[PDB]
Write a protein that binds this ligand. Structure first.
Ligand SMILES: Nc1ccc2c3c(cccc13)C(=O)NC2=O
Length: 350
């Protein structure tokens, strides 16, 4: 049997659940009959990104309609979709193409999860759970519900739950202290930077085996820069509300996972509107999309020398901004060090 604590066992079973992986794919409208979990390959996903990149270019620059039709057929043949009784939409709308780029970001993590699940499991001397936990190469520990660490994090969750996102409540079910192998090391150089903060990152539960084993990562070279609001970086938030939405939970499936990572922001290049950033201005270390609401700068605390913006949602003086909430983007995988993983319970108002 498993040597791991119960909360951690429940966590492993949850991130490796095969049924959740299928639900995710059915939701992206993939045809599970033509495209089973075992058919997914990284090369396949790379080519799909390239196709999306080309079609995105042809829509923007007014390429032939025959070109867009050809690219659409190749995309749907590479990744079989099931639209039921409706006709398949062409990749001729920039919003639809963005939807598809997002689907691929998720398929990248689902592919990692399935590969690990089917890997070296022959060992009979270890419980299946213990075997899959080791595959994550991440030390996971339960944070004592009554310690100072946990108090601060629960304060951060309670105070930063936005006004317009109150279509649900949030209950912190469990807090885990996580330390990915070799991560503290690649992050060392950035401890020299100032403006290091504890920020939020939400994602589907189906992405967590991939996130824990490979860490958070930027979209590959093939992905269009357009598929992302501020370019190809790693996104974070300071309001639990904003990130919580990327968890994709519902009344039917209320438990979500969310990360707190230490991010080396340094001098932020502040923006009020989207900008498909490629080059970062000299002297800048990250991007900060300015929002209408942000935590009260008055209440900001420190946790191991890292700033925690746990203040209550206060309205900032900027009005000429498109964003409702702040967004932080780093363009280097080494600029983040993950710290905690929270198990949240979304209580939907009914
Ligand atoms: N513009 C964003 C796009 C994606 C995410 C995101 C997050 C937080 C703040 C902004 C964005 C997040 O936590 N996960 C995300 O996946």
């Amino acid at each position: 049997k498993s040597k791991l604590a119960k909360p951690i066992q429940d966590l492993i079973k949850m991130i490796f659940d095969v049924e959740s992986m299928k639900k995710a794919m059915v939701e992206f409208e993939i045809d599970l009959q033509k495209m089973p979990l075992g058919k997914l390959s990284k090369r396949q996903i790379q080519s799909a990104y390239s196709i999306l990149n080309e079609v995105q270019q042809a829509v923007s620059d007014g390429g032939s309609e025959s070109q867009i039709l050809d690219l659409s057929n190749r995309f749907y043949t590479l990744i079989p979709h099931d639209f039921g009784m409706k006709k398949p939409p062409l990749l001729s709308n920039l919003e639809y193409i963005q939807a598809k780029v997002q689907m691929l970001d998720n398929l990248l993590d689902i592919e990692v999860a399935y590969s690990l699940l089917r890997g070296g499991n022959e060992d009979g001397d270890k419980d299946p759970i213990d075997i899959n936990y080791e595959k994550l190469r991440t030390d996971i520990k339960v944070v004592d519900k009554d310690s100072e660490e946990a108090k601060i994090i629960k304060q951060y969750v309670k105070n930063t739950h936005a006004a317009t996102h109150n279509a649900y409540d949030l209950k912190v079910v469990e807090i885990f202290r996580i330390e990915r192998e070799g991560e503290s090391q690649r992050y060392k150089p950035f401890k020299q930077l100032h403006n290091r903060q504890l920020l939020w990152h939400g994602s589907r539960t189906t992405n967590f085996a991939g996130i824990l084993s490979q860490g958070l990562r930027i979209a590959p070279p093939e992905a269009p820069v357009t598929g992302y609001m501020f370019g190809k970086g790693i996104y974070f938030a300071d309001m639990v509300s904003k990130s919580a939405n990327y968890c994709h939970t519902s009344q039917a499936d209320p438990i979500g996972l969310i990360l707190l990572g230490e991010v080396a922001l340094g001098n932020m290049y502040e923006l009020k509107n989207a900008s498909h950033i490629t080059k970062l201005p000299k002297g800048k270390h990250s991007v900060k999309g300015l929002g209408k609401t942000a935590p009260d700068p008055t209440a900001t605390t420190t946790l191991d020398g890292v700033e925690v913006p746990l203040g209550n949602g206060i309205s900032t003086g900027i009005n000429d901004t498109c964003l409702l909430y702040n967004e932080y983007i780093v363009y280097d995988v080494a600029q983040v060090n993950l710290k905690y993983l929270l198990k949240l319970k979304f209580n939907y108002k009914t």
